[PDB]
Amino acid sequence: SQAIGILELTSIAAGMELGDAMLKSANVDLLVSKTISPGKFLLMLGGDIGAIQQAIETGTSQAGELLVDSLVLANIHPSVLPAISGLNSVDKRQAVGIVETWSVAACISAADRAVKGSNVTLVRVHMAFGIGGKCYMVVAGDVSDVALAVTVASSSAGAYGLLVYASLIPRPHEAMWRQMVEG
Amino acid sequence: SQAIGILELTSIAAGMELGDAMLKSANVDLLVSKTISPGKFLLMLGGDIGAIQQAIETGTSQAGELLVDSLVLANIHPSVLPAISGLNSVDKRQAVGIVETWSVAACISAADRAVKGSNVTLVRVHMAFGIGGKCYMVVAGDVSDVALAVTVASSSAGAYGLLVYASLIPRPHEAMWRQMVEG
Amino acid sequence: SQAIGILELTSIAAGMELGDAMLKSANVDLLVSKTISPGKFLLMLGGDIGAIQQAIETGTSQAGELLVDSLVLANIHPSVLPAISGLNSVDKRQAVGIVETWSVAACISAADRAVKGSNVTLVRVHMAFGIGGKCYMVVAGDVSDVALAVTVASSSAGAYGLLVYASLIPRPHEAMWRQMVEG
Amino acid sequence: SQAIGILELTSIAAGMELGDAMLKSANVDLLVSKTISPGKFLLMLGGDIGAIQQAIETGTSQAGELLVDSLVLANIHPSVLPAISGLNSVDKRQAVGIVETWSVAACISAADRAVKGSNVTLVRVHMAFGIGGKCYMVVAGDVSDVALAVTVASSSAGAYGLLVYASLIPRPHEAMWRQMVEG
Amino acid sequence: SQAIGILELTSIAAGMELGDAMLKSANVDLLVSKTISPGKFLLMLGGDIGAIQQAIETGTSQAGELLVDSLVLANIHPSVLPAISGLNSVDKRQAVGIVETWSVAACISAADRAVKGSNVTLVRVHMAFGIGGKCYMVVAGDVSDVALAVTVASSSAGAYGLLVYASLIPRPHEAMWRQMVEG
Amino acid sequence: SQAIGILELTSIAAGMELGDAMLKSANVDLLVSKTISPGKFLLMLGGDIGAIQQAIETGTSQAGELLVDSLVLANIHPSVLPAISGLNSVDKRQAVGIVETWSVAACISAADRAVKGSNVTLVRVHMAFGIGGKCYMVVAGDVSDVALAVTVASSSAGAYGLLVYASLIPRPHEAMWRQMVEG
């Protein structure tokens, strides 16, 4: 029902002007607004499909040659957006699943598939260094729910040859729990 | 507890003589004894560690330059062996997990970690074309049991960078079931 | 009225999951579901056009980078489907016609043109080694019916420069009959 | 007194048409009629010299450019023909000799020399993958008879630098016996 | 019973002198006597085998270094000769078959095979540009007779890998008939 | 039980000094002590394992950079040693077996396996030109004994890909016997 808008610019100045412009243009949520090395700027938006398409169109149009990349990931589960913008709350210490991918796009799709495919909590979708680099999604819940989530997410990523590794941590320890679930 | 002994020869004649020789030498069970393209012969032995080590040593010693490859996989779960030899019986139509790898060495280790870290039935360990090629292991049971099993085995293969793909088929079809479980 | 759906994957695991997925998705019939060397998997579906298109779209979409090839051969004669899946029964020992081609697609189109173009029995459509390799179709009946079938099928394959050879064997040796017709 | 006819074609269709043609042409026995990778077809015939020469001449003439190879192995011992077409019966579990060669031609000559040179039973002449690949002949009988057979056959093959390996299995075990003598 | 003699010279002067010389030498009939691009001369003779052999021998001997090519096509059906020299009369508008080949030799042998192999009328054997270029033969009669003719002729040409295309025109049109049959 | 010690030096002077030194060091017997082309010296010692190991260690230690090669072959049959040193006596004119190899190391191992796995007389182990060159072993006795012997020894050499050829001469000739058995 929802959507992810990705707009990567070759300029920070352009990114901020365009980012502001996109927020005013429709009812969109800015999930990410950061500089990536070696000078590129990243804008990540959440919201209803039409709003995202309108913002990304306004963005790309105004962007001109400053546009590095623009992507619209459609039909995303609601939980995915806050997992991109920050963290989703975990009710209790249970099993943890981590699926590592190449590209935020692949990670988002894996996360989405996991969310539909199970009763897990999608804790967060992390980007180590920009849109094409190592990304990981963290899921929490029953060992069985986490196993299903992990297999589903791995298969999603693996299908596009962008799966790095996926792990299941039943009964994680404190140090790790805080580090996996809270960042 | 058990062990898998792998011996690949550059000659069918050598393979049969060596195969027979290995069977007489210890209390090993011939699991696989076939020709692989483009002329190489494969021998796979099952049994206790010491017997397998003795058999593989006798094999490699007598093999000389005819030896292509020799491998000894120890601390192997019982169920694994007959899944290499042939098929393991499935009590009822439930979920099916398939983990695809590069190398039987890898597939065996995946299948092993599966069985230990689950209540699944390891149906079979298939080699499409020899020891280094595409291999797949088929597990059956609860969707949750298959899910754990599939993940574990995947992470096993993934760690050595030899996972191809892995899939979960809950509620498999009339025809696909016969193919996946019966060969 | 009928259609052929061809899906070739780079993974057996993906092939089985996708194959099962396609069977559930529409009222399609699995004609071929086999591994091809050196690790690629083949899916061939028969059924009504819309069902085949939906199935192949679902297949290709889910396949991602694991997709080797996908094809939808439309407006196929009913008899072609069982000739792909297995054999069609021959009423009586009469003349035999063989048309050899490069690609199962060529072969199917040749077989289809032969079936519409004559009163022959299309015995079988055989693939020696996968979708792009040597294929052959076997027809039986009157020497005249077989001649028409063979010329038609040759002129179909030849048009795309994929005709290998075509032969007419009026009254074959029973040994040859048992081979070409009876499989 | 007898002879082996070898006709290898670049087309399956041509192979079947020509194969049928050869069977009708003279009193010849079709010992082999199979497809070889990557699309070539193999015809192996047994019979009296004149019949074989006539069939191979008819074959090669009609073959034209579709001819890959044609060979006539003359003065072959009767037992060699059924050993090519299938298996020769072994009276009792005794010693087994295996001689491995490159090319069916070399294998046939070695088998023939072994048959004349001893009281062994030539069980079978096997081709792993076509006319030029790994071929092996299996002999059975007394350890002394099998030793003579093996030395003779090895010397034959070795003379043309086409011997791969040759082994003597006195007292083979069941698993192996069934696999060496029955295929 | 009849034969075709082909003599291609590197000189028109030589061709005419040699052409005349052969006509005097035996009871041969000049079928074709024309210049081919880019300066080569072509002579085609019809008659009894011995006469053709004598004429072609005399031709090649006297030709010396001016000889491009010489060929004697033996055991040719009488109807082929006038089909080379000109046209054969068609009794009634029926189906038309066209077999296109590379080389007049391949076309002649296809035409001959078609004539023996059926009750068709061989209308003409056409050469577009010299002995090695595109040639076609036109047959007329029953759709069944024409189909048999076309399959036979195609298999002939195809065997030597010189088949271009072959077509069957049942019920040809007012204008196309005149073109296909009358040149 | 016995051992063969091989020491090849880059100097004749070093070879003689080292040779003498090795004889004094243990209860080893000098089997071979000769110059090889193009200046290298060869020493072959016979005796009990420990003595041979001590001798070869003393040899290699004192040899320094003058060492070309050193080898210790253990579990050698008595008969082998004098067949290296010179000739073994043949009781009567019977069948003769000759097994030709690359390297004396290989020839010795072949000759060994022969003697253990037969009742043949190992007549001699000949080196045409040094340790790595053509070597042959001559066995005599029953055709059956020679046959077993020849095969065993061949399979030994073949396994290391160092068999050249092997022959069986039942009923050898007046002159050839003297050459084969007496040198």
Ligand SMILES: [Cl-]
């Ligand atoms: Cl910033």
Ligand SMILES: [Cl-]
């Ligand atoms: Cl949700």
Ligand SMILES: [Cl-]
């Ligand atoms: Cl177990």
Ligand SMILES: [Cl-]
């Ligand atoms: Cl139909």
Ligand SMILES: [Cl-]
């Ligand atoms: Cl076949």
Ligand SMILES: [Cl-]
């Ligand atoms: Cl016989």
Ligand SMILES: [Cl-]
């Ligand atoms: Cl001894």
